[PDB]
Amino acid sequence: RFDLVYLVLDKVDEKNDRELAKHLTNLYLEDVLPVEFLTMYISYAKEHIHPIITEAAKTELVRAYVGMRKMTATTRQLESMIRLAEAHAKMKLKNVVELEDVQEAVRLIRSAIKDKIDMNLVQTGKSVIQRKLQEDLSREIMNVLKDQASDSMSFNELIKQINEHSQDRVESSDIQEALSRLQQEDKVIVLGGVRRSV
Amino acid sequence: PSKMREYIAYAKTKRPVMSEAVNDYVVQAYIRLRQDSKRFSFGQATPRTLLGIIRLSQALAKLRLADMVDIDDVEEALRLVRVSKESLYQ
Numbered sequence: 001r002f003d004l005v006y007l008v009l010d011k012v013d014e015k016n017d018r019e020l021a022k023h024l025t026n027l028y029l030e031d032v033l034p035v036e037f038l039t040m041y042i043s044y045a046k047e048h049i050h051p052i053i054t055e056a057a058k059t060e061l062v063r064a065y066v067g068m069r070k071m072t073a074t075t076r077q078l079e080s081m082i083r084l085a086e087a088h089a090k091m092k093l094k095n096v097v098e099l100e101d102v103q104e105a106v107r108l109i110r111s112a113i114k115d116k117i118d119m120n121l122v123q124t125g126k127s128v129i130q131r132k133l134q135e136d137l138s139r140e141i142m143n144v145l146k147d148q149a150s151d152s153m154s155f156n157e158l159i160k161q162i163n164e165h166s167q168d169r170v171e172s173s174d175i176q177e178a179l180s181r182l183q184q185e186d187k188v189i190v191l192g193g194v195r196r197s198v
Numbered sequence: 199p200s201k202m203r204e205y206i207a208y209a210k211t212k213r214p215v216m217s218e219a220v221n222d223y224v225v226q227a228y229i230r231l232r233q234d235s236k237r238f239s240f241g242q243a244t245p246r247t248l249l250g251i252i253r254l255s256q257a258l259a260k261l262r263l264a265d266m267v268d269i270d271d272v273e274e275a276l277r278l279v280r281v282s283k284e285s286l287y288q
Contacts, residue, residue: 012236012243014229021225021248028216028252 003080004112051089053082057097061085064106072116081105133178136166141188141197151197158195214259217266224251227276241283251275 010016034041053061065078084105089097116124140161145151153161155172162175179195182188189196228248235242254275259267 012232014233017229017232018225020245021228022221024245024248025216025221025224025252029221 001076003083004108006112007115045090045093049090049093049095051086051095051097053086053097056099057085057102060099060102064102074117077109080109084108130174130178132167133170133174134182136162137175137178137182138187140166141195145197152194155193155195209260209263212260212263212265214256214264215266217268219269220255220272223269223272224248224255227251227272239286241286247279251279254278 061078061081065073065081068077081102085097085102088101088104089095092101094101140158141151141153144153144161158175159172163169163171179188179190183190187198189198228243228251231243231247251272255267255272258271258274262271
C-alpha cells in the first residue's frame with residue numbers, strides 16, 4: 001500500500017563518514033537555500049498546477065511496466081508510476097506529463113525496490129519448503145501406519161520424528177501450518193494433541 | 199550546594215565556541231570509534247555520539263570558564279564514553 005519504500009541504511013564507511021563527521025561539526029564554526037520561499041513555492045504549486053498524461057507518456061508507462069513484469073511487478077506499481085509522474089510534472093510547474101518525467105518515476109521506484117514481492121511473508125525459497133513439509137507429513141504418517149500398531153501418534157512423537165532426523169530443524173509452528181492446510185485438503189484428523197491418518 | 203549553584207548559573211552563560219583543533223581532533227577519534235563498532239550488544243558509534251562528545255566537551259569547557267578551550271578538554275569527554283562502554287561489558 002506504500003507508493004515508495006526506502007531502505008535508509010549505510011554501513012560504517014570511512015570514505016563517507018570522514019565527510020559526514022566533518023560536515024556535522026561544521027555547524028559550530030561561526031557566530032542556495034529558499035529557507036521560507038520553498039514552503040511558499042510548494043503552496044503555490046499545490047494551488048495552481050494540475051498535470052495530465054500525454055500520449056507520448058502513455059507508451060512509456062506501458063512499456064516500462066511490461067519491462068518490470070518481464071523482469072515481479074503488481075499493478076500497484078503502475079498506479080504508483082502514474083501518480084509520481086504527475087508529481088514530477090507538478091514539480092517544474094509543467095502542468096503536462098511527458099517521457100522525461102516518466103523516466104524519473106521509474107528510476108526512483110527501481111532505486112526503491114531493486115536498490116517475489118513477498119506477499120503473505122512468503123518467499124520462493126520457503127514455499128518450496130512448505131510443500132516439502134506437506135510431503136514429509138504424508139510419508140512420515142504412512143510409514144508409521146505400516147510399521148506401528150496405530151494410524152495416530154502423540155505430537156511429542158511427531159516432533160520426535162520430524163524435528164530429530166528428517167530435515168534441517170523445522171519448528172512446531174511450521175508443522176501446524178502444513179498440517180492445517182492438510183486438514184483443509186482432508187488427509188489427516190486432528191483431535192483435541194492427537195493426530196490420525198485418513 | 200548554594201555556592202555550587204552560584205558557580206553553575208555563571209558558568210552556563212559563557213557558551214564556548216569551537217577552536218579549529220577540536221573539529222580536527224574529534225573526527226580522528228570518531229572514525230576509530232566507528233571502525234571498532236564495526237568489529238555484543240547495541241553500543242555502536244551513531245552520529246548522536248558525535249553530537250554527544252561535542253555537548254560533553256562544551257559542558258567541560260563551561261566548568262573551566264573560557265571563551266574556547268584546547269583538546270586537553272576533549273580527551274576527557276571521550277573517557278566518559280569509553281568508560282561507559284567498558285561498564286556495559288562489566
